Symmetry: D2
Subunit: 333 residues, 4 copies
């Protein structure tokens, strides 16, 4: 199985490691985060406000972590060029700092001997992939992106609807949990002015390319889909709200059938289908990219419908990072 | 000038009272709520988790409330047929209990001498009005409805866009603060299973007739608009998300100009226009029905747009209740 | 293995069922809740905003629930005297509705054939027990009380410190999650004015007898301990803050060693001891009554100390309900 | 009136500016914050999630702010030694960055022409003052501290009780709103592991010198008071929980009378007294240091009592900064 390094031991970094240990699909052999010392890393991994306590064994030994018997090297370099990935055999680097999302910045990991870099975020210039949507277009690039949590929710849904019914145009709102880039109380934000307002007290509109990025992993939809997001006071779990017009005449039951069929077939494990009366906490720690909520949507007429899909923005995306490393390593061989 | 009675001294009942006192546009002379004694009512009106402390004077004087030197009768009748509205001269009754929303149930207020009843909610069998949209169609019905907060947000915006660009079809999501019918922890809500889950910890989808009701106050949009709601962990203030297709070709700048124009003219005080980077707390205790957020919307192409508009679901709607009573009282006088 | 019926399928009722299934220490064979139909009951038990999804299997078969293959009768009786506990063999009845906490009202279960009633709350007159503190004083009463979540947190801690150091006097604050009796938005609470204010937006002082009740389960502490609570914006998990004066001289390390010793011996599974840097979510779904937080306390001097102890007010208490039934059934048989 | 500069336009800096404008007691003529450009500063000041919209008028002119007609210079210097305070005549500097809390660091402001520096936080090596407690001990130090929000709450209460009843010993818990140092989701806080956990989902214990500092502003209480903090999911407003033993015998009514008397005389505007059933939001934007909550406290016996006092940790503290500057300016002038 691929040997993995994680740069940035944050929400995504720690949850990617949970998914690695849970599945065994990759072997995380090295960790880097200059703002966290090894003993502190043990604390942050063991206790989690969102996904509950870690259920395995973890201890510090020397400057390293030991998790269920396996040693993980822990470094504290601010410059990714100084991380010696080769000492542990770390070949596939998860770049989850949030500060090295361009190909140039991410490519620093090759200095320490990395083989591939997976940016855990959209990138201005690295090719983006969404498992179940366009992984087969992978063509060997050294630095790649797994897009965003929101794109991983919308794109499997949009691909399925387009294939069956032909999307003419669509607009998305992502009703999204607050994240680490937001603030407890009103303070300065680097992304945008609204982004700094008290996270747990506000609905906060936020612009996003993640719906437009659907048009890059699904070229047939370029220029046909865009949208925005509203950050809301939940610590985790988000909801895609997708209003879309089809070329074909559909009923809503036919929309549901198309989703159900994809969830039981080509997108099983990626796109789920439910008719239960679920709320956001029911999707906590669920590893799907996208769970279509049959009862939450509505059709106005035979061509114009609203559909809704849930995603654990931390947990589903993080499993997809693992899935994308496994797939790319197969192709590289 | 119009003398008002309020049945149900809840979020809407009390916030209607603050708007009456703030504007002086109506004189509230009587209140009824069987689950609040007069001393408790003073406390509930004095302190408010959402809109801050009442800035005036209030005291209890023997079963009555006195606010800024004016006596307000206070009753505790479970049956609205037993409220002697005539004793205080209350003629226009705000029916804001949530349990008397039909013409039959709301008509009980006439037994005690009410002249008109305004149901603070959509109604199955009473005409619905949205100020700035269709109040001129009022023709003397004795039981009327002020619709919902959400319809009061969407309809003035849809009217403006329809008038200027012709709406082909539109779908709405109301991202809505939690309310009194929701629960702190997972509890029974047998008629709305999701609505029983812990309110401040969940995103909670809900169906709503509020967008379809836009096609009832704007008959030209009948069959062209519907939508749903998502209840979210805020104590107040909500956000309409409107995805709409126009028959005419538009730029987003043209959409903004149409809204700004209406806000500076025929819908002043009802529909506001902003380009500021606001968030929900900035709309707290704002009396507009609808505040169009120009930087939050987006146009995909020349006919297909998503626009967003804020509303204080408590304070905007409550000011409209006062506005509607004034308007109807004037019409009842000629 | 005792056969249990649960009356009131609420937070405590459902979490008691979770604890019964998790441990197998009792067999829940019947449930009653008039406000929940069987298909709704499956939903409310399957999905939980606080403790997550149920990991086993559950379905409805006819009017019953089937959980992990076992059939569980489900009734919908408003009057507990009409619940036919006998049909399923239910002998030990968890009275978790919140509304039948006196012996007079709780005794209604005996009509349907109950053998014992455990009130999931303090009782005005039924004897109260805290596992680890006074269950040996149980003498065969047919209606008993498992006290409150807070008493179950404070009393095992107070007993240990009293046994070792002699408590002269103590005052407690329970920093407590909000509960089902609180309100999402400012609402009517005629017997607890503060308790009606928006739960997720306020710190809400509240008086409690739960610290004085430590004086009933530990009679030597009668009149030496009381306190109050503050209800805070968390959906679950609470924290006892105990400020206490000892007759003996102690260091804070001796305080810690006494609690660690108790946690490894006589109070294992009831009182836990930690030096970790935990926060409230770390105690979610933790079955202990009391988790002493070593780093959160502080000593002013050799006789005056502040200790703090965590408790999942739903899950800890609910496991104690299961433990108490087990203990009492053993006593009933020898 | 004194001319003021503010280094650090954060929660305290902006709420200090609001208090200066509200009272006119000082004239703010310059601001510095390298992370907030002028147009961003206008937005952050105009719109506040906690205290609401700014009521006055504000605009940017070039690189400076203009607020209600007066120009305010705005700099973005990361090194306070480079702020040209003299250009605007700013003499009294509010040091509210959180990062220059020592006499050596705060002294950087003198390079730019400042006359006095008031650190908006406790300091390891500058004298701390609490208005109503020890401001008369000021004797011309050039770098002073206004202590913390929590010490400004506890000290006036502790002085009053100790003056009348003699405090033998006391322990405090500050139930405290979360602040800008905390995190929205679990993130790094290597000096305070608990302080990194999701602020709005957790109760978070924390050590604090704020209770011990009461023994520094009140030397007669040295060694007799300490405590800790629990950070909770509110955006603002905190609650002091003070458990104290007196040397004299007292009733609770006598405790109440002593607090009320102080609130009406020497501590007016500093310590408030209430018997209302208030909750945290009722203290929002209240400028008192300390609001004694009569009904929330409890006496165990004639010497052992728990008292509770509310404080808007942003607004009360900020008004005290303004008050301290006024007082120091008058003493500086004779
Ligand atoms: N949280 C989500 O829902 C989510 C979902 C999908 C993608 N993402 C993306 O994943 C990335 C990480 O997000 P997050 O939520 O985990 O953020 P986070 O703040 O929780 O974690 C980022 C971590 O990177 C560390 N770091 C900072 N500078 C560093 C450096 N120079 N070298 C190494 N480590 C450094 C920080 O200490 C922190 O622990 C971001 O790009 C984000 O946009 C986040
Ligand atoms: N809250 C909102 O945002 C909002 C906005 C627009 C409209 N509304 C509508 O306004 C109505 C009231 O909503 P609310 O949020 O104020 O609810 P609420 O629960 O806060 O208020 C209801 C009040 O009615 C009282 N009441 C109950 N039974 C009564 C009776 N028999 N006689 C007299 N009074 C009685 C209750 O004691 C309570 O004080 C509802 O129909 C709601 O749909 C609410
Ligand atoms: N939640 C806690 O933290 C906690 C902890 C310890 C003890 N308790 C006590 O346990 C009891 C239950 O509390 P809860 O938090 O589970 O409340 P809850 O509201 O979650 O549960 C009450 C349940 O009882 C049902 N009920 C109402 N009337 C009934 C009737 N006549 N017959 C049968 N069922 C009826 C309701 O439908 C509801 O499902 C209360 O007395 C409470 O004080 C609660
Ligand atoms: N918030 C409270 O309740 C409270 C109460 C009393 C005291 N305090 C104290 O006041 C101080 C500020 O607290 P806050 O809550 O306002 O924090 P905050 O983060 O809201 O404000 C800090 C401000 O200082 C600015 N800043 C950072 N580095 C700077 C530099 N080199 N030069 C100039 N400005 C810089 C930041 O941009 C930010 O605007 C802290 O010392 C805090 O302990 C806070």
């Amino acid at each position: 199985v691929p040997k993995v390094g994680i740069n940035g031991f944050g929400r995504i970094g720690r949850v990617v490691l949970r998914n690695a240990l849970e599945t065994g699909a990759v072997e995380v052999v090295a960790l880097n985060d200059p703002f966290i010392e090894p003993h502190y890393a043990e604390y942050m991994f063991k206790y989690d406000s969102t996904h509950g306590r870690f259920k395995g064994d973890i201890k510090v030994d020397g400057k390293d972590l030991v998790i269920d018997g396996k040693r993980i090297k822990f470094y504290q370099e601010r410059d990714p060029a100084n991380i010696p990935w080769k000492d542990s055999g770390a070949e596939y680097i998860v770049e989850s700092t949030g500060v090295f999302t361009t190909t140039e910045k991410a490519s620093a990991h090759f200095k320490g001997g990395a083989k591939k870099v997976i940016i855990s975020a959209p990138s201005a210039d690295a090719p983006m992939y969404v498992m179940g949507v366009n992984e087969d277009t992978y063509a060997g690039a050294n630095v790649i992106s797994n897009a965003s949590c929101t794109t991983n929710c919308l794109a499997p849904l949009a691909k399925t609807l387009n294939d069956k019914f032909t999307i003419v145009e669509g607009l998305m709102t992502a009703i999204h949990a607050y994240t680490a880039s937001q603030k407890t109380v009103d303070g300065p934000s680097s992304k945008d002015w609204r982004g700094g307002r008290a996270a747990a007290q506000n609905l906060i509109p936020s612009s996003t390319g993640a719906a437009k990025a659907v048009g890059k992993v699904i070229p047939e939809l370029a220029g046909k889909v865009t949208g925005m997001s509203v950050r809301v006071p939940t610590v985790n779990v988000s909801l895609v709200d997708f209003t879309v017009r089809f070329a074909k005449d559909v009923t809503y039951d036919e929309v549901k059938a198309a989703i159900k069929e994809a969830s039981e077939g080509p997108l099983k494990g990626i796109l789920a289908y439910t008719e239960d009366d679920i709320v956001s906490t029911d999707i906590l720690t669920d590893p799907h990219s996208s769970t279509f909520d049959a009862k939450a949507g509505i059709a106005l007429n035979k061509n114009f419908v609203k559909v809704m899909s849930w995603y654990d923005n931390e947990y589903g995306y993080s499993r997809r990072v693992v899935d994308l490393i496994v797939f790319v390593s197969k192709k590289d061989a």
